[PDB]
Design a protein around this ligand. Structure first.
Ligand SMILES: *[C@@H]1O[C@H](CO)[C@@H](O[C@@H]2O[C@H](CO)[C@@H](O[C@@H]3O[C@H](CO)[C@@H](O)[C@H](O[C@H]4O[C@H](CO)[C@@H](O)[C@H](O)[C@@H]4O)[C@@H]3O)[C@H](O)[C@H]2NC(C)=O)[C@H](O)[C@H]1NC(C)=O
Ligand SMILES: *[C@@H]1O[C@H](CO)[C@@H](O[C@@H]2O[C@H](CO)[C@@H](O[C@@H]3O[C@H](CO)[C@@H](O)[C@H](O[C@H]4O[C@H](CO)[C@@H](O)[C@H](O)[C@@H]4O)[C@@H]3O)[C@H](O)[C@H]2NC(C)=O)[C@H](O)[C@H]1NC(C)=O
Ligand SMILES: *[C@@H]1O[C@H](CO)[C@@H](O[C@@H]2O[C@H](CO)[C@@H](O)[C@H](O)[C@H]2NC(C)=O)[C@H](O)[C@H]1NC(C)=O
Ligand SMILES: *[C@@H]1O[C@H](CO)[C@@H](O[C@@H]2O[C@H](CO)[C@@H](O)[C@H](O)[C@H]2NC(C)=O)[C@H](O)[C@H]1NC(C)=O
Ligand SMILES: *[C@@H]1O[C@H](CO)[C@@H](O)[C@H](O)[C@H]1NC(C)=O
Ligand SMILES: *[C@@H]1O[C@H](CO)[C@@H](O)[C@H](O)[C@H]1NC(C)=O
Ligand SMILES: *[C@@H]1O[C@H](CO)[C@@H](O)[C@H](O)[C@H]1NC(C)=O
Ligand SMILES: *[C@@H]1O[C@H](CO)[C@@H](O)[C@H](O)[C@H]1NC(C)=O
Ligand SMILES: *[C@@H]1O[C@H](CO)[C@@H](O)[C@H](O)[C@H]1NC(C)=O
Ligand SMILES: *[C@@H]1O[C@H](CO)[C@@H](O)[C@H](O)[C@H]1NC(C)=O
Ligand SMILES: *[C@@H]1O[C@H](CO)[C@@H](O)[C@H](O)[C@H]1NC(C)=O
Ligand SMILES: *[C@@H]1O[C@H](CO)[C@@H](O)[C@H](O)[C@H]1NC(C)=O
Ligand SMILES: *[C@@H]1O[C@H](CO)[C@@H](O)[C@H](O)[C@H]1NC(C)=O
Ligand SMILES: *[C@@H]1O[C@H](CO)[C@@H](O)[C@H](O)[C@H]1NC(C)=O
Ligand SMILES: *[C@@H]1O[C@H](CO)[C@@H](O)[C@H](O)[C@H]1NC(C)=O
Ligand SMILES: *[C@@H]1O[C@H](CO)[C@@H](O)[C@H](O)[C@H]1NC(C)=O
Ligand SMILES: *[C@@H]1O[C@H](CO)[C@@H](O)[C@H](O)[C@H]1NC(C)=O
Ligand SMILES: *[C@@H]1O[C@H](CO)[C@@H](O)[C@H](O)[C@H]1NC(C)=O
Ligand SMILES: *[C@@H]1O[C@H](CO)[C@@H](O)[C@H](O)[C@H]1NC(C)=O
Ligand SMILES: *[C@@H]1O[C@H](CO)[C@@H](O)[C@H](O)[C@H]1NC(C)=O
Ligand SMILES: *[C@@H]1O[C@H](CO)[C@@H](O)[C@H](O)[C@H]1NC(C)=O
Ligand SMILES: *[C@@H]1O[C@H](CO)[C@@H](O)[C@H](O)[C@H]1NC(C)=O
Ligand SMILES: *[C@@H]1O[C@H](CO)[C@@H](O)[C@H](O)[C@H]1NC(C)=O
Ligand SMILES: *[C@@H]1O[C@H](CO)[C@@H](O)[C@H](O)[C@H]1NC(C)=O
Ligand SMILES: *[C@@H]1O[C@H](CO)[C@@H](O)[C@H](O)[C@H]1NC(C)=O
Ligand SMILES: *[C@@H]1O[C@H](CO)[C@@H](O)[C@H](O)[C@H]1NC(C)=O
Ligand SMILES: *[C@@H]1O[C@H](CO)[C@@H](O)[C@H](O)[C@H]1NC(C)=O
Ligand SMILES: *[C@@H]1O[C@H](CO)[C@@H](O)[C@H](O)[C@H]1NC(C)=O
Ligand SMILES: *[C@@H]1O[C@H](CO)[C@@H](O)[C@H](O)[C@H]1NC(C)=O
Ligand SMILES: *[C@@H]1O[C@H](CO)[C@@H](O)[C@H](O)[C@H]1NC(C)=O
Ligand SMILES: *[C@@H]1O[C@H](CO)[C@@H](O)[C@H](O)[C@H]1NC(C)=O
Ligand SMILES: *[C@@H]1O[C@H](CO)[C@@H](O)[C@H](O)[C@H]1NC(C)=O
Ligand SMILES: *[C@@H]1O[C@H](CO)[C@@H](O)[C@H](O)[C@H]1NC(C)=O
Ligand SMILES: *[C@@H]1O[C@H](CO)[C@@H](O)[C@H](O)[C@H]1NC(C)=O
Ligand SMILES: *[C@@H]1O[C@H](CO)[C@@H](O)[C@H](O)[C@H]1NC(C)=O
Ligand SMILES: *[C@@H]1O[C@H](CO)[C@@H](O)[C@H](O)[C@H]1NC(C)=O
Lengths: 125, 103, 443, 125, 125, 443
């Protein structure tokens, strides 16, 4: 499982988006019998929290998920070639750390809950 | 090795500037230059640490900077409780000492 | 035009501090609790990745320090306590044939010890070193006490627990990764352009010693000089050798282990006597190999202090015995060797060495309060061959001569020893979730 | 995250159904280093059990999920206006505690497993 | 919950595929207060790992999941009647233990990641 | 028509009992293990929610009781044991100038103590209080023993562990919530129409005392009278004040701490002597403030016992010293104050008070078996200012006069003290999953 882990860390975002399963499979597994257990418990919570995010968004069970949130040029004005072909995910995460929680809120609030309510109303027509 | 003027002087309300000059080359060794104030009779207290940082509880009046070999303090807002001995330090070296006389 | 797309599994990480667990292939470091290691552990090279590394803020060193201290306490907990040994001792000089080097270092002490029956006592005698015995009174009464009786309780180490360091590996839990700097000229701090990810660190032996780093890792090409601030004389300089210097340490005396029953099921292990002659413990190093190694260290120090500055090595200026001498544990015995002949040289820009060693049987590892350990004697003769792979040096400050720099051995804070092995490892946490613009819109 | 938690506890079920993400995000995180760890472990199990229910039903990854189980007037004869506009979720849960496991069984057994088998058979046409 | 557990272990695979919820619901829950806790933690990790497999495949939230991996006669030449009507799951698992990781790799690599990328590209037309 | 729709995240809860964890901003209550608190903790008001609350079945009180006892045991575990102190003591009366209040309360006892050497003993002398010393025999032999030597082992409290109560917060784990009743006239039990949800409780200081609640919470508007059954004289009445009464407690004697080495690294801390005169410890309360506070308490009791019933306050009818006196820990010293002047009044419907206090150095907290604690002396003079924020009263039953009610101080069960702070908090578990009819059908 470990093999290939973080190998595309220095690759472009496009090239590094085809190895998502390699990172995904590496997120899940005498006081030293307690502390290690705590670490195991910690890993589970982190995994579940990320999965919870994917579930409050319409992204449950997916590694690549398309959404209805428009991109804002304030978050980033770079082209697609300057993000996917000429840029790595670490650089992108360093720039967009500043805006992550606005995008997360837009993902959580407007799009998924309005889409879910609209499916609730279309299903009773 | 950190020469300092023998004495400095100011008038209440104006500002004073003390200079510390280092014989050695720059060699990026001047990042950590601190200043001390020794009211006669007591033990020195720290007014500036790392050129232009202030210990919590030190008034904004004391403020130093640096230029190459030289590095200076600026006592802006000179009162009558400024008759002390001011010493520049770079690690273990201490300055020679400047007696700031209030006028 | 562009829409938010969520990606899970993104190869992004953050600086983190977590509890790294253990992997290893009747031991002080437990080893049973530590997880078994896996053969052929994967190493993955991260290409086009430059990662900042700080050895001097690495939480792996603090965790290792805490873990080794805790493991030592856990090993000591179930062993025989020697609190009854705080009695008046009647000590005389050994009457065998004793070399001048050892005349007065070892004393023959008699005392009234307890037995398995609380209403009986036994008259016994044990050999004790002079660095473990204190005169009870200034007057010549010949009554002595153990060194720790006034300040700390003493526990006997279990004879069945070996003191040999074994390699241990620190492994990240899931969601975390260990990054290894593979640059072979890495000064310790700064960007590393050659990075790999590992499941665990290499085999690190938690060797406890001062002034010399023993059985450590070697520099790949050149001697490495690492310091948090080379202009700050309050910080230690870690020297990593590119070639080991072989050091041969021996306790020449043939030794016996005498077992005294002090309780219903408690045994105290005394030296008893020495068969044959009595000779001083010592360490030998090659003179030429040490001299070339010091030449290389000087060559590297001149890169920081000047091509024309005189580099002088001198012995430790002060501190306790653990830091004024080269202290180490080998064979089960604790040696405190005098390195005054290793660091005795002036280097201007233009056979063997024998280090006497003293022995103690009462050790206070680290600087804990109210807890000491008695080291039981080891039967036979101890012969030890170790590699010197580095130095811990301190530069003399306040110099009045700017053309000469003086370096002295230091140590006593084992975080500087274990930081000499963990310097290339960093712990990060994985951030698999990310967002990016694409042209794909949700239907 | 905590902010707004249980705020719609006294609101109507309709108004309180638009804040589901606020409660959802608050379900996931020396003997005192063990007991607290047990509590953390307990939380995980509870979360997973609820998620497991949602997965055995056709509701995985959703906060609002529509099903094929008809409502039974025996469970409740109240109108929609008397449930969503004039009633809170605590009152509803107190009445329908009595019938919860019948609805859960119908959700588990007939609808999801028959739908899943019917998709298994439609996919091979 | 326990009732009926593993009851179809000796039944045919077809008959035993209608009781999947019974096994699914039974996977999730002083040194003896630590060891038992470790066991609980262990169960969670196992569950999550299996769920993770289902998520890296296109099978999240499903107990029966159809895929695009063709069956290979090298893995098994038996008919459908000799697998579903005349065979149990234990016998099938004993034969196909040898081939499980090839099928798992094909499930993980070609089909799901190529399908996910193709949906990423269809959604931007 | 209508179909089952599943909702996840439903704001519904159930009564629950779980293990609430800790939040706090060398302490008895650990504090290092307890999680650090978070600034500006969120409080959310639940509007249109009426929730039933029972203080008298609140599992937060039982958990707090267990946690405080366990923390006390954990604090005592690593401290010096004083089992060697069970020897014959030769006690005489103190020969300094002693006030009549204290003539015979403090004794000067000499004894043969152990030393760091098992074959030596020392003759030492320590001052002991009369409430900690027992005559060995009825005859006038002047030989005495410590009070606990026959029934329990004694452990010395670590001098570096402060006995000052610090606020602690009880926090719910994920999936659980703490509901806080915000009604300001809440009698303890019943529906609460004003409810909020909190991450954690307010800062609760686990103050250990009897008969008076010290450094607690005040009632917002009026004095609150809370009882599980006001008609049941076997249950205690908790009185919460709306204004604090300041109490000033002092140990006037200047005190010294004498350190005696009893083992290799074990120290026993004796009182030794008193510099200056010897005076009785005591507490002062304002007479007028106490009298108005009692008037308010009577005014509130008449709401339960009648507008024309006479309310009488009298001292404790019996029990151990911890419950017949106002016991408390302040400054590190344990005071047992005589409250016979606080409760000495008849109230018909129509300066300062000085309470003498006795000191013990040997304390058996709670009612554990076979474990006592020696309280080391505190150097200097102890001056303590506390707020009295409530009372624990018991009503006299079996009365033969129905026109008068008599209330006496009680205590000794600390769950009644900590229930005076946790009365407004309830723990519930969240039920996020629910079903409801809608018109939406699955395709
Ligand atoms: C640096 O590394 C070297 C090489 O690993 C290391 O020297 C080795 O030390 C060990 C332990 O001291 C030696 O092994 C011992 O050898 C003697 C020879 O007679 C044996 O008697 C010993 O066995 C007895 O003691 C054991 C407990 O210690 C018992 O388990 C056993 O039953 C016996 O009673 C033991 O095997 C080893 O020989 C040397 N190796 C060499 C090449 O000299 C050195 O100590 C390390 N340096 C430091 C500072 O740690
Ligand atoms: C109700 O609350 C009040 C107010 O908080 C509280 O009174 C306070 O008690 C503490 C502890 O007794 C006092 O703090 C001490 O003050 C003395 C004054 O000289 C200091 O010497 C003490 O420090 C020594 O002791 C410490 C250990 O206790 C050591 O850590 C330290 O190094 C010193 O050796 C200590 O600061 C505080 O002054 C009073 N406050 C007032 C206003 O009187 C009272 O105890 C609480 N009531 C109850 C019943 O708990
Ligand atoms: C240490 O002293 C003891 C006596 O305190 C010595 O033991 C005696 O040794 C002589 C040697 O001729 C024997 O004859 C005696 O019988 C021994 N006495 C006992 C009580 O055992 C011991 O030899 C001395 N050891 C050293 C190394 O000096
Ligand atoms: C308690 O008794 C001891 C003796 O048991 C007293 O100690 C002696 O005090 C006198 C005072 O004049 C000294 O001269 C002696 O030298 C002391 N003797 C020792 C052995 O120390 C002690 O003072 C008494 N203390 C009190 C408070 O009564
Ligand atoms: C690193 O960059 C080079 C181009 O400089 C590229 O060819 C190579 O594939 C990259 N490595 C990885 C792992 O993507
Ligand atoms: C983009 O962000 C800015 C603030 O940075 C905001 O004012 C603007 O409305 C945003 N645009 C869109 C289209 O959401
Ligand atoms: C977009 O592409 C052009 C192509 O010439 C490039 O020069 C430019 O820097 C890019 N713009 C941004 C904002 O990334
Ligand atoms: C966000 O702000 C931080 C400083 O607070 C800055 O370092 C970062 O680069 C900012 N974002 C962008 C896109 O520059
Ligand atoms: C015994 O040895 C000591 C060294 O500790 C020495 O000073 C002393 O003179 C010796 N006494 C003898 C041989 O009587
Ligand atoms: C042992 O005890 C005896 C008395 O039983 C005493 O004479 C002798 O001196 C003691 N021995 C030592 C070595 O202290
Ligand atoms: C390592 O280089 C950095 C600059 O990249 C410098 O701050 C540090 O002092 C260097 N260390 C040594 C030992 O030269
Ligand atoms: C030490 O003495 C014992 C006595 O039995 C002997 O067998 C052994 O060989 C001796 N060892 C050495 C290294 O001289
Ligand atoms: C150390 O060197 C000396 C040189 O005289 C030699 O006699 C001795 O045997 C050597 N020791 C070891 C342990 O090799
Ligand atoms: C150390 O011992 C080895 C054999 O173990 C020998 O070859 C080497 O020369 C010795 N070194 C010294 C410095 O005496
Ligand atoms: C040590 O090496 C240096 C090289 O700098 C040389 O000058 C010196 O003679 C050598 N000394 C010995 C004793 O080998
Ligand atoms: C260091 O060497 C000097 C002689 O140069 C000596 O006096 C001193 O005691 C030695 N110090 C140590 C710690 O060995
Ligand atoms: C140190 O070197 C000097 C010569 O500089 C020599 O006389 C002396 O013996 C040496 N000391 C040691 C302890 O090796
Ligand atoms: C010393 O170093 C050499 C070369 O790296 C190595 O082969 C040898 O095993 C090392 N010795 C020890 C005792 O670790
Ligand atoms: C509480 O009820 C009132 C009507 O009585 C309503 O206006 C208000 O919005 C409700 N509060 C909440 C939080 O829903
Ligand atoms: C509704 O429930 C009753 C029992 O309460 C049952 O007999 C009836 O068949 C149910 N109706 C439907 C339509 O399922
Ligand atoms: C349905 O709505 C009517 C409207 O008049 C109301 O009176 C009645 O109580 C409701 N019925 C039920 C069963 O809730
Ligand atoms: C279910 O039964 C209980 C008594 O067992 C009762 O309290 C509850 O209200 C019943 N359900 C309904 C809808 O009344
Ligand atoms: C066991 O096999 C028999 C036929 O031999 C069949 O009728 C029966 O249903 C099977 N049992 C189960 C539990 O499937
Ligand atoms: C089936 O498996 C064999 C190896 O067992 C392989 O060579 C062959 O290509 C596979 N067939 C298909 C259609 O994938
Ligand atoms: C398929 O079915 C036939 C029907 O006659 C049966 O005999 C045969 O064994 C089956 N083949 C395989 C490969 O299972
Ligand atoms: C897989 O290989 C093992 C032996 O390694 C064998 O027992 C098993 O039956 C093989 N698979 C099949 C389908 O026979
Ligand atoms: C000593 O004090 C006691 C009080 O415990 C008293 O009864 C007794 O008479 C006193 N004896 C004297 C002063 O001799
Ligand atoms: C202490 O012991 C001696 C004998 O060594 C005895 O005479 C004396 O009375 C003892 N003291 C006490 C206070 O019991
Ligand atoms: C609180 O009121 C309830 C009735 O709501 C009653 O049972 C209880 O006794 C009251 N408590 C007091 C102290 O009056
Ligand atoms: C107590 O006595 C000591 C004796 O040194 C003195 O310094 C201190 O001030 C005295 N304290 C009081 C409160 O009288
Ligand atoms: C208590 O009151 C009395 C009244 O005489 C006074 O003398 C004493 O000093 C007071 N005590 C305190 C501690 O305030
Ligand atoms: C208690 O002490 C305070 C000062 O700390 C004082 O103002 C107050 O009057 C005192 N109270 C009494 C009842 O003596
Ligand atoms: C106490 O207050 C009451 C009010 O009910 C009053 O009658 C009485 O005189 C007061 N007593 C004192 C001593 O203030
Ligand atoms: C209570 O007061 C009476 C006098 O009214 C007294 O005899 C009795 O001992 C006192 N009880 C307590 C416990 O103080
Ligand atoms: C109690 O009150 C009476 C008067 O009723 C008074 O004589 C007595 O001194 C008081 N007792 C105390 C202990 O304050
Ligand atoms: C006593 O209460 C007042 C008013 O509530 C408060 O300001 C003061 O801090 C309290 N004192 C103590 C010691 O808690």
């Amino acid at each position: 499982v470990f093999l290939g882990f973080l190998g595309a860390a220095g690759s472009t975002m496009g090239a590094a988006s085809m190895t998502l399963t390699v990172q995904a499979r590496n997120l899940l597994s005498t006081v030293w019998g307690i502390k290690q257990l705590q670490a195991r418990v910690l890993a589970v919570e982190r995994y579940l929290r990320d999965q919870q995010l994917l579930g409050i968004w319409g992204c449950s069970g997916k590694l690549i998920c398309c959404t209805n949130v428009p991109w804002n040029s304030s978050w980033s004005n770079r082209n697609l070639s300057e993000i996917w072909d000429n840029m790595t995910w670490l650089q992108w995460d360093k720039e967009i750390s500043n805006y992550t929680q606005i995008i997360y809120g837009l993902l959580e609030e407007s799009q998924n809950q309005q889409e879910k309510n609209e499916q609730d109303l279309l299903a009773l027509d | 090795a950190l020469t300092q003027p023998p004495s400095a002087s100011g008038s209440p309300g104006q500002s004073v500037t003390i200079s510390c000059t280092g014989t050695s080359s720059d060699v990026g060794g001047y990042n950590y230059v601190s200043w001390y104030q020794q009211h006669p009779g007591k033990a020195p207290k720290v007014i500036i640490y790392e050129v232009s940082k202030r210990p919590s509880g030190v008034p904004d009046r004391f403020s130093g900077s640096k230029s190459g070999n030289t590095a200076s303090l600026t006592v802006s807002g000179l009162q009558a409780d400024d008759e002390a001995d001011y010493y520049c330090s770079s690690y273990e070296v201490f300055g020679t000492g400047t007696k700031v006389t209030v006028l | 035009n562009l829409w938010v797309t969520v990606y899970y599994g993104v190869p992004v990480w953050k600086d983190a501090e977590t509890t790294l667990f253990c992997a290893s292939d009747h031991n002080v470091w437990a080893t049973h609790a530590c997880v078994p290691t896996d053969p052929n552990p994967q190493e993955i090279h991260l290409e086009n990745v430059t990662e900042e590394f700080n050895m001097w803020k690495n939480n792996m060193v603090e965790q290792m320090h805490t873990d080794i201290i805790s493991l030592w306490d856990q090993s000591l907990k179930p062993c025989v306590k020697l609190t009854p040994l705080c009695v008046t001792l009647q000590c005389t000089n050994v009457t065998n044939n004793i070399t001048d080097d050892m005349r007065g270092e070892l004393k023959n002490c008699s005392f009234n010890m307890t037995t398995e029956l609380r209403d009986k006592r036994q008259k016994v005698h044990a050999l004790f070193y002079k660095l473990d015995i204190v005169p009870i009174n200034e007057n010549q009464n010949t009554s002595y006490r153990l060194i720790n009786c006034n300040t700390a309780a003493i526990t006997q180490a279990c004879p069945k627990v070996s003191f040999e360091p074994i390699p241990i590996h620190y492994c990240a839990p899931a969601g975390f990764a260990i990054l290894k700097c593979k640059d072979k000229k890495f000064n310790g701090t700064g960007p590393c352009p050659s990075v790999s990810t590992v499941q665990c660190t290499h085999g690190i032996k938690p060797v406890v010693s001062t002034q010399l780093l023993l059985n450590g890792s070697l520099a790949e090409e050149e001697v490495m000089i690492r310091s948090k601030d080379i202009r700050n004389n309050a910080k230690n300089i870690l020297v990593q050798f590119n070639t080991p210097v072989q050091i041969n340490c021996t306790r020449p005396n043939n030794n016996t282990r005498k077992s005294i029953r002090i309780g219903p099921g408690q045994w105290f292990y005394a030296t008893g006597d020495i068969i044959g002659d009595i000779r001083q413990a010592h360490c030998n190093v090659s003179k030429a190999t040490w001299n070339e190694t010091l030449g290389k260290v000087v060559k590297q120090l001149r890169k920081h202090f000047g091509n024309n500055t005189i580099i002088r090595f001198a012995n430790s200026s002060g501190g306790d015995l653990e830091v004024t001498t080269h202290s180490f544990n080998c064979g089960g015995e604790f040696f405190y060797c005098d390195t005054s002949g290793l660091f005795n040289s002036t280097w201007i820009s233009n056979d063997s060495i024998t280090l006497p060693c003293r022995i103690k049987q009462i050790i206070n590892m680290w600087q804990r309060i109210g807890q000491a350990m008695y080291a039981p004697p080891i039967q036979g003769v101890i012969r030890c061959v170790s590699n010197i792979t580095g130095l811990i040096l301190t530069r003399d400050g306040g110099s009045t001569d700017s053309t000469t720099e003086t370096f002295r051995p230091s140590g006593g804070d084992m975080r500087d020893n274990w930081r000499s092995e963990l310097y290339k490892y960093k712990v990060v946490k994985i951030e698999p979730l990310g967002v990016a613009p694409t042209r794909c819109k949700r239907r």
